[PDB]
């Protein structure tokens, strides 16, 4: 989909990764970046992905690298 010249990630979420590596794992991190590409430095962390009204925590797995955080949060409730 996206062009190969640079995988996109937001600047605020990239700062949240850097403090999480140095200071160790924390409580699940609330964010709104559903468009960020998952990098290998995020494996192990729990990122709370906003889906319209709440934040759903997502435990990052090794094979999640390359996907988006929006691909793990359903935005509507179906019955």
């Amino acid at each position: 989909r996206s062009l190969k010249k640079g995988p996109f990630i937001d600047l605020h979420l990239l700062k949240k990764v850097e403090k999480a590596v140095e200071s160790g794992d924390k409580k699940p991190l609330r964010t709104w970046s559903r468009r960020s590409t998952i990098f290998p430095n995020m494996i192990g962390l729990t990122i709370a992905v906003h889906n319209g009204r709440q934040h759903v925590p997502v435990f990052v797995t090794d094979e999640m690298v390359g996907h988006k955080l929006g691909e793990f949060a359903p935005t509507r409730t179906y019955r």
Binding site: T61, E63, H67, E71, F72, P74
Partner: protein, 114 residues
């Protein structure tokens, strides 16, 4: 004539008979015949066994068999076992890449019933 693609191609022209193997369309069948040196309008008649096994080696680079069925399937199993949004689409039989679900979703949903 039994290829590594065990399912027997029909006794017709070469570029048509290679299409019956799962994973070889019209374009890839042209690439094998161009790399081997066999004309596309040559039938299974006069296609000698020295000309069939050189087609076995050219198709050997690509995995085109029931082994290709599981590699497409386990790629979907990577989605469904992960718990992603796209993995939820395959489990219920819903369209994935942006097709609407109001009407005209008959391929994904299956036949109609109220």
């Amino acid at each position: 004539a039994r290829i590594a693609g065990i399912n027997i191609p029909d006794h017709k022209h070469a570029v048509i008979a290679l299409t019956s193997i799962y994973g070889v369309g019209k374009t890839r069948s042209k690439a094998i015949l161009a790399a081997a040196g066999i004309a596309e309008d040559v039938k299974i008649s006069e296609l000698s066994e020295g000309q069939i096994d050189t087609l076995r080696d050219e198709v050997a680079k690509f995995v085109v068999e029931g082994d290709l069925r599981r590699e497409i399937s386990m790629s979907i199993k990577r989605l469904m076992d992960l718990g992603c949004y796209r993995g939820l689409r395959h489990r219920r039989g819903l369209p994935v890449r942006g097709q609407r679900t109001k009407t005209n979703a008959r391929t994904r949903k299956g036949p109609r019933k109220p």
